[PDB]
Amino acid sequence: DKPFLSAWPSAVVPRGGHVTLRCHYRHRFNNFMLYKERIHIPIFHGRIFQESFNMSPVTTAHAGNYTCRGSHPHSPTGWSAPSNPVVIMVTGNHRKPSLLAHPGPLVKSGERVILQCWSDIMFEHFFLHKEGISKDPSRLVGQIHDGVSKANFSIGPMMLALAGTYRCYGSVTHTPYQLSAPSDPLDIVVTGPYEKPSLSAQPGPKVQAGESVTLSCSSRSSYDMYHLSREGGAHERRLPAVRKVNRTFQADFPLGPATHGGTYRCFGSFRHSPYEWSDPSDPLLVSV
Amino acid sequence: GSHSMRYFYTAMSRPGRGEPRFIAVGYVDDTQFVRFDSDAASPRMAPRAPWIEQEGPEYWDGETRNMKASAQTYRENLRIALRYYNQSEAGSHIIQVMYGCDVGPDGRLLRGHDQSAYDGKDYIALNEDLSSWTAADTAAQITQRKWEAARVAEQLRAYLEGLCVEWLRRYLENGKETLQRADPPKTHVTHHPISDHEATLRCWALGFYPAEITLTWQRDGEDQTQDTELVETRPAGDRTFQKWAAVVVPSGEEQRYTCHVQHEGLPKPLTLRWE
């Protein structure tokens, strides 16, 4: 008689945010008591939740390790066995750490990437969390070297399930369920096995000031969007693909006024899947 | 005769009721031989037919490993389907997959299959050529563009021509005595009065394998299709099957009626009658 305890939309939640605990027992989101990691001490002086327990606005007092017990009337005890444990982690309590991808955020399908979390603050543990509904974070102890605390999260074999927006957090010794503010987000993109597009310049890759240059991304594969990336990525540009007379799917990226140029690559992608890209096109050097 | 191997996958989201569940089952004709359920404490591909139990540890580990990756792929597939269909994150949805091969008497490929469904309706299917797809709606049309762009049919065709046919052949030799020896049905006719003017005649077929069978009632040598009640073939629970056919007859006319049974374990069709 084990209930199913869950947190909605996420168990990793900012202070001031909202999270609901649900206790699914005997084909219902029925009555239950909540317990903290103390299997016989019900919280809020033995409060019986008549429905899902909505914690809003979220405070640091909500952070913790929970189990529930569903109402089991005719059993010796009027309550079920303990549920699965759900750890509510409350974010926004310390300065954010930094997050970096090694060798970079674009990962070939089947391969591996290191997500490095680091801080000047001495954090006991580091948490890596992919953006989404009902996502579980990974934890590593913080390593210490030359005044910095750090952890290396190995992600792979790369596939769509591992692609997305990642954020990392630190926690300090006496408050394990209290996380820092999140690091700046990192977009991890899976490349391939979708066929590489073709990248060309119009009228060509050699240009001088005051003259326009357009980069054309093309394929016979039905991509819905194209991504133009410049070596030493400041920001990727994206445009919808348009079907041509000869059945190619193309996008034209006009380079603006006084463009510095450099090395370019392009990628195709599909509607509703922004972190899943084709193999990169061959590089194109644009001269000014 | 001809034989078939199929894998059936069910992936189901259930928010607030459990984590997304993935169930895989394997069949050789009408016999289930393996299973995987992501809900077990330690999930593994597991034997379901005694003839597969003596496959070495390398077979079970290799299958467990592939099933774990499939559960991970279908969990993500449920997520993408919500974006495709503009559906709430609170609802429960189901993806179903069926794939496998049909071989002839020689043991050579007759037909390859790979079919998917979303919420009980066709989503995407591999065509008979094993090199093109049929998409049922605008959402599956996105999946088609991705699979054509990644050359998915090519990998499917190599499985269906090679490994699928080769493994089916190995399984047929493994379980030769239950898979390739047709068990004829045990038959009998029962009588049940309804009133003083009518009665029910029921023809039974029990303990048969394979599931395929034909039961018909004839009145003086004419087929009683319009008035025959035919129950769905059901499992006996011991890898054999059961079926019955009933006809309403006027009292004192039972002698005019004959039951006819056709099954591969029967060299000639059987004619039965009540007495």
Binding site: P193 | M45, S70, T73, A81, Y99, K146, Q155, L156, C164
Partner: peptide, 10 residues
């Protein structure tokens, strides 16, 4: 034996 899962989904 089951088909080796594609790195690619829906």
């Amino acid at each position: 034996t089951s088909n080796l899962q594609e790195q690619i989904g829906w």
